[PDB]
Amino acid sequence: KAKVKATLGEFDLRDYRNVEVLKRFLSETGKILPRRRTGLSAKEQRILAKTIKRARILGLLPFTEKLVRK
Template structure:
């Protein structure tokens, strides 16, 4: 009797569980179904380590603005690509530039319509 049930399952296309051929390890679909393009992630290189002539100066407001987000937060290492050593220097340089009013603490105002009275 067990052999008959096994034969019935094979005829119906039963494989003994879910069909996981179209999914990767995390449960998402393969890249092949999206058109065959795979994204290539290049490792970010610290611009200060790569180019020794690129000098960090807290008096250069344009350069300091590159390391500050729209709301005034300092851009983290994982986004800017700087190494830990130079990220600490960037942080102190941005804070010095803020204290000297070369760059603002908050570069843009609130977007929800509130205003100070």
């Protein structure tokens, strides 16, 4: 149940262009994962947010998705 950053490399938080890493911070849905599960810090999380949103505008990352099972 380890938090994201815990299993992850050394990466640029301000890079909107890189999906490979950023996707990992999103949820099953398109939601942006809370700090509890992203293992980040205040400033960290706060930069990640704006970065993700940037990506989203570019269509690289989902605004939202659909849930499965249920």
